[PDB]
From a paper:
LmrR is a transcriptional repressor regulating the expression of the multidrug ABC transporter LmrCD. In the apo state, LmrR shows high affinity for the promotor region of LmrRCD. This affinity is reduced upon binding of a drug at its drug-binding site, enabling expression of the multidrug transporter. LmrR is a homodimeric protein with the drug binding site at the dimer interface.19 Central in this binding site are two Trp residues, W96 and W96′ (residue 96 from the other monomer), oriented face-to-face at 7 Å from each other.
Author numbering:
A (entry chain B): 3 to 69, 74 to 108
B (entry chain A): 4 to 69, 74 to 109
Write the structure that this text describes.
């Protein structure tokens, strides 16, 4: 079994990395992820929009419009910084664990 | 760093400790302190809080071994969950790298 809180986290990481590659709109994101996952992850629009409201509510991402009009989502600098801390944070965890194996 | 994220990390480390072998609270705090070379000094209360949840979820059990000490064990479900979870997160790493090919 896997904690649902944990799959929700993974999906967040993947999404944030997509915007890290560059700004994008929802349909392009699921497509990009569906491809990169070779088909195992078909994200549903409804739950995905639900997640993006939280991130914008956290200022981690912003949104805007551009044409063929589509609403694009941007990785904010605050989002950029948080991702750095998180990866650096999680990097220390991997080191803690490796030491434990001694 | 999200406090939510530190609790997850703290959970991962503790479980990886018990994967090394059954242990008691002060032994676990010591092992983590050493493995982090002093950067993570967990207080007794936080482990009890976390272990109460894990014991209730069947992820760990406890037992008295001797000079009395309360030992904590990672159950079979816990091992499987750690296995499944680590497999899970490994899949994410590929999805992301594929995104960079994209
Ligand atoms: C891109 O880095 C991240 C950025 C933000 C959040 C995260 C992560 C992240 O990498 C991450 C994980 O790698 C892992 C987890 C996680 O929550 C995050 C993030 O939240 C959860 C996990 O600890 C389990 C088993 O629950 C396993 C996994 O670590 C992997 C690699 C470790 N070296 C260790 O072997 C562990 C058991 O599995």
């Amino acid at each position: 079994e896997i904690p649902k809180e944990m799959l929700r986290a993974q999906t967040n990481v993947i999404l944030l990395n997509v915007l890290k590659q560059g700004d994008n709109y929802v349909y392009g994101i699921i497509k990009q992820v569906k491809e990169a996952s070779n088909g195992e992850m078909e994200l549903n629009e409804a739950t995905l929009y639900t997640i993006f409201k939280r991130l914008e509510k956290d200022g981690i991402i912003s949104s805007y419009w551009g044409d063929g009009r589509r609403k694009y989502y941007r990785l904010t600098e605050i989002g950029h910084e948080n991702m750095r801390l998180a990866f650096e944070s999680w990097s220390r965890v991997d080191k803690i664990i490796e030491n434990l194996e001694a």
